[PDB]
Symmetry: D2
Subunit: 415 residues, 4 copies
Amino acid sequence: NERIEKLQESWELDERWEGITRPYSAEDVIRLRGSIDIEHTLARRGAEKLWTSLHTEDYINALGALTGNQAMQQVKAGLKAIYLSGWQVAADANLSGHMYPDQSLYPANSVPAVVKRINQTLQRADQIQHMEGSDDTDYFVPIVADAEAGFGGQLNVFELMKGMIEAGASGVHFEDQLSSEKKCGHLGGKVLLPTQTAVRNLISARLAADVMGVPTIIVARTDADAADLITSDIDPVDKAFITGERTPEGFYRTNAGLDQAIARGLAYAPYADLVWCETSEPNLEDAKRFADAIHKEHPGKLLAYNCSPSFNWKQLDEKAIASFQKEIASYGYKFQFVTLAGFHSLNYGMFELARGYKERGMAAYSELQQAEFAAEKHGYSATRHQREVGTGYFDEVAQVITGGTSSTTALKGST
Amino acid sequence: KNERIEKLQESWELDERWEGITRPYSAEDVIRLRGSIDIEHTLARRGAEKLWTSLHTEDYINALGALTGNQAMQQVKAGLKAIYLSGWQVAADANLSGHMYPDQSLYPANSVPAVVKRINQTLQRADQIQHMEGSDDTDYFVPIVADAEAGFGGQLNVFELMKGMIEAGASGVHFEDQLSSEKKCGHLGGKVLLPTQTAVRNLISARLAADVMGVPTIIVARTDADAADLITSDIDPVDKAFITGERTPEGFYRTNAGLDQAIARGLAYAPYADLVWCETSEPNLEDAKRFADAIHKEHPGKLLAYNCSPSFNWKQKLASFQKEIASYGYKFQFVTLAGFHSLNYGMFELARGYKERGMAAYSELQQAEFAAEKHGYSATRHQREVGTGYFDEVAQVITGGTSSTTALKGSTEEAQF
Amino acid sequence: NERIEKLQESWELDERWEGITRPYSAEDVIRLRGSIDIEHTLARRGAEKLWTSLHTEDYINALGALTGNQAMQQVKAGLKAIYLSGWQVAADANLSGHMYPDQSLYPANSVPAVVKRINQTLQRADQIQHMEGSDDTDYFVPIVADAEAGFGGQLNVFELMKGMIEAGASGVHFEDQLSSEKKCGHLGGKVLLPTQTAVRNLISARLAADVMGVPTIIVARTDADAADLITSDIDPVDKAFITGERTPEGFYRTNAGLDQAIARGLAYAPYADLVWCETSEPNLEDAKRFADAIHKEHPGKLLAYNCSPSFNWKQLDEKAIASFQKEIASYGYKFQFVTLAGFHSLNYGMFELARGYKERGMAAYSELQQAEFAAEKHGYSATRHQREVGTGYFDEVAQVITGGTSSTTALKGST
Amino acid sequence: KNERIEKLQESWELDERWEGITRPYSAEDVIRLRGSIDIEHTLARRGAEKLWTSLHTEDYINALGALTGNQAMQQVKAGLKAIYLSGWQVAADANLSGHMYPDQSLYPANSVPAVVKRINQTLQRADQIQHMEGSDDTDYFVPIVADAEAGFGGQLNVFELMKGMIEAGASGVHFEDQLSSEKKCGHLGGKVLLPTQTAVRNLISARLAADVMGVPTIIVARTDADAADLITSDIDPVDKAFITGERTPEGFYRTNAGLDQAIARGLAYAPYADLVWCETSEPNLEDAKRFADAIHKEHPGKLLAYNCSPSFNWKQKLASFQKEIASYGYKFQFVTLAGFHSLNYGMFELARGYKERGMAAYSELQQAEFAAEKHGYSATRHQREVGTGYFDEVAQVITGGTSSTTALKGSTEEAQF
Ligand SMILES: [Mg+2]
Ligand SMILES: [Mg+2]
Ligand SMILES: [Mg+2]
Ligand SMILES: [Mg+2]
């Protein structure tokens, strides 16, 4: 009854949970935890640090990362969150090793492997700085990871959520698409789950976070803006949008648009810490519309916005773009992210370098290196590549093990 | 048995591929170790045949380090004729432990083979998108040259590692004469050489594995003996010329590190490898010429390999470097850590841009990506790049074309691109 | 047009494909293969060897294996196929490392990792025998692997099938359950896919087998015997069984039983090489019923039967059990398998050994060892444990590399 | 900094845990290497504390090799108080390459940690099923003792491996004094010893890693020097007593293999380990007594570890063996390859049964499983065993109990069991 107490208590009495329904008991959670409590330091400090930041910052902008090096540069650049894109993992970082489109094709433990990758890189960055006493950068920046539609049912979602926390994610996002026909937000052929089925996914995620004993941030996303199909008419709430027309597959045609997005947003809002409307373009008016509707029933709900590379941020005007993030943080969009920054950064950079190189050999490469040296004074250390990867950290381990007598120390003698 | 031994025996004596190569074992030994069936390894064969051919056809072949499928994919698209696979890059950002490590054989031994397989599956999906659309004649199956470090242990770990590289579809593999338990990056201190006889055993085990796998995989013998001023032992008469007599606390022996200790190693290894690589501390034309001249006196025409390392300050303005050393026999040239510097510098520049100017910094990259299209860059159309069109073609074939949930038709990539 | 030829030809003209519909062109397959052909020796010889065996044997009985050692003993015992149970992988051999029930909880590339495991063990067994010339056992025995419901949609099935072939499976089985609510055949709460959706999975698998250029054997399984729920009324064919009643989730109540099993079996039969009816008990009468109905429309269709450890093969009579397999091979069930033999073999053996050991120490262990020695003369080599794992094979590699001068050879000096 | 150094410094000087243990490094060094935060490792701590406690409380602790969660799970259920994790078994049937290997460090170095994590996740699910039902008071969190072989390389690979073991929730880890590139099973020929100073460095690196991970993980120093008649080098004065002068082609040195070379190693290692293990070629009571007496003269009460190996013909009928050697100080006793013999013999007996008598052979096993239930065997009810009841309880909590698709109600395990 005492482990149940120090849980039921926190719910009642913690501002962290104001405007959050949990339609299970603290008795249920402790029945599923098993007989002991396992601490998850990284995911707990993470969840706490992201929650603080979202209330103490004007807003928090992130870029997608599909490597720990990529995330380490985000953090050395001064970003205060990391976005783990399911698209990017599908494209270049999943456990199958295949390039896939964004249709839940990869094995469901792929994203959590990348979260652990990122945290292990950040820890090494922290270990190097600590040993040196060379700077006071907090490398443990919260990671917000894509759980797509949970890769199947309520129990897959549960397992996935447990995986994300084990890995040490600070926040996870679930979308109201059908796992079986899941797509990129900015592709056609999207299929919605009944509102109740999307709400059961969100309860599942939170119950998983409760069993793991961690206040992980849960983002509810809706695809209901473009999505004009749904799997069932079973929820009265959705009958308001169905035409009655049906595809061969059996799915139901629906009136997509900001109305459906808004219907989902208010339904999911009592079960999420942030709400996120996938949009087909970066329309300020629609962002404001979407926000207001949520805020009427859910005053000061933290909202999230995908500043998508699937948009042409130029066909949009130049001064509007410089001010977009500040402009939408205004409406309540306190977590903002460029989903595919890492994919475009990675492909653009290697294509331009390989072409410089094919055309002009090491001259081309010396342009990167020189660009690297000029960037040292701004906090780019990766130019000194052996230090960046912790060659100095492992030298110090060798000196401690050998009491200083090692002749095979790496850094002294290096060229 | 005599059946399979003879196809093998024939090819060893007839194919110009194995000219100037010794095998100190027999076809009978190879078939004894193979098992009762022959398993085909299509991409490893086609790659080894293509890489060899292009080494005897091009002025030279120049590569960059790839640490992801996408990176390798942009290298092919831009016109490069091989992919270098850096174990350093894998240590740092792409190994199966998920840790950031320095170049010291700390990662799990099957890591580079995993990245080889990744790269190959990316290239296969790139071809499949091209094939389906009949929209270009690009060969996306370019040879991968993979880092086997010092083999992660002895002669059997080398055997296993060499087999892994080939199953994953590597065309070339390099082994270095360092002690595995003390392995380092070429450009760090505290390198410990293996006795020469021991370095020769590893290249022999490497050739046994490729013969057993029935694939003519390229082997690059690498020596670290330019900067490495320790050897595990005085057992090999050939190494006594360079041993000072001084021992370390650990029991290692001091050697006179230099170009001569490298020339000694290069000539020991040249019979047992298809290319030879001397690691160097600076881009020195006269060391490269002397090392080449020393190798060509005993193996005229021997293919040589040069690491144009990012550990050097490319401020040698006396470019024209690749052409110059290619004229000395250096046909395979690669910038080991290109992938790490590209990825790392790239995100840092964008992230700093982003902190400062928000979505304006993102717009600049998009608009640089559109500008690269005339050069043949397609990743700005990213749904097509990762094969959304290919999986809609799979969907349409399964449903006979009634599929309602096809992806591209009604995507922001149709309207806005 | 010539790679299309040496495909369209095989279909028309190969007995292997008699009574098999492919509702796509050879043009479609070659459009998806890409520009070259990759040989898969193991999966091709496998598919050929299993197909031969099923026509040249009275029938083929298998046991479930969740390790390569387990499969090596099956083969040294004289079995001619191996059954890769999705249940067992869920229980003790999946890439997540968790014990799960049989509800598609594990990552979707888990089963193909176990097929590659098994083939790598068998190859080592073949390499040892070859080197020695000590016996002529064919260790490359066909593996028949569980693809559950494909872990999502038509494209997951496709990817999974490709995975199974890459791994070197000789046969794969897909079931007409909903991936999202998938269960063990012998559990409650089963949910059927529309017949057309189960038929699209099977086309998907075969198209994948066609792109991979391998005549992989495809088993269609139905859960329609116990399963009394279905996801949609969209297929006219299924309206014959729905009551019109609906659960909260939205699913449709159905009249389960041999009639529904038979409806699915004839629907799936033109798209599969074997048909398999999951049954709630080992009823000879129902097995015969099921067979006859299939054979009327599909004369001499190869059928498959799960002799399930979920049955009490004793509450069944003793002489009926000794003759069951021969009895049902009679009706056309030429592929028969004990799904969970490996799970029960593994848990029973370790529990009885640990208890013997707790009670009587090394005396207990010497009973196993003595049981092991008596079993040598029947073809159990694992008693000589260093040879079993290829210590001799790697010694011979060391002698070849060193030209015989090795002083660190393993076997000479062994105790 | 002084904060964290002192909790550490305190515990080293006060806790009876570290009595008779040297650290040749400082708390300051440990905190310098940790990073800026303390990460907790619950199962590694609770396990190390439980294993230590039970080693000072029980006549002795006896274990069998587990190579799967299920196997470990049956060992706990049957009443055993630890699980041995064999690297040999992992080589053979349970490593991350998926190959069958002999005991020679050919598998990927993160393999045993993966099996440690597997076993722990199985035990966690076993507890969760027990907890949910309030149906027994069994402690399923029994200490796992894991094989780190010779570390897969040098002092840094040992450091990394020791960290992996702890993250995965190992309670104890053993390191052996063999050369990694030549590692063997204890009972094969061609074992090559590391110089003593080198074996000591590895146990020091092992303790640094556990101190840095802030967990009191048990370390077992193992010596192979009873049968191993080669050493890599003559560098260590302590080893000159046993070196004959004869060198091998490879440069290894001949040593006088025996109990004396083992006693020399055991006493070198005892200061740097929590238990000491002498590998032996036969179950000899007088060697075990002499080895124990030699260790207890310098470290009275030192905990000792005995491998009751399946490589021996248990026909020593002069059982009562475990009690006898436990009386000599051998508190941790384990049958390394039990899991492999259990799994292998078990399927072969069943498969031969099955070829001969079909489903009658299966019925016998079922009926043996029912007979074991009175002893407390539950796996015959297999849907419950793998937690079908636990995931139906998860389903009911998510749906508030309207779930139609719960699994057990209307299963053959309800009716027929
Ligand atoms: Mg996504
Ligand atoms: Mg390297
Ligand atoms: Mg199954
Ligand atoms: Mg071992």
